[PDB]
């Protein structure tokens, strides 16, 4: 009657805490992906 709403507020704060830590992870992910994507685009022009 009361605590379900604020426990879901606890869950949305915990998800906000989840979606900060892997910033470095996704930065490394995107940089590696840009590297492989540009190597592929430089490859695919040759064929």
């Amino acid at each position: 009657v009361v605590t379900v709403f604020l426990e879901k507020t606890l869950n949305i704060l915990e998800e906000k805490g989840r979606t900060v830590s892997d910033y470095r992870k996704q930065l490394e992910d995107l940089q590696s992906e840009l590297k492989y994507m540009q190597s592929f685009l430089k490859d695919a022009e040759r064929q």
Partner: protein
């Protein structure tokens, strides 16, 4: 021989992975910190494989005197 650029970048990346993998592996001989180190390095290896592989799925491929 006769290798494209994606293969070159993948080889250059896997060498760095080999070095850090056999770097952290020597610390085998709490288990908590070493288990999470194993987790991070396994997941990075698997992620790199998964995101490299479709680029190889896309395309297919002297000296004398």
């Amino acid at each position: 021989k006769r290798t494209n650029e994606t293969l070159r970048t993948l080889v250059a990346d896997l060498r760095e992975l080999v070095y850090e993998a056999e770097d952290i592996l020597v610390d085998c001989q709490l288990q908590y910190k070493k288990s999470k180190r194993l987790q991070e390095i396994n997941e990075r290896i698997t992620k790199i494989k998964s995101q490299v592989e479709p680029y190889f799925e896309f395309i297919t491929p002297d000296r004398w005197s």
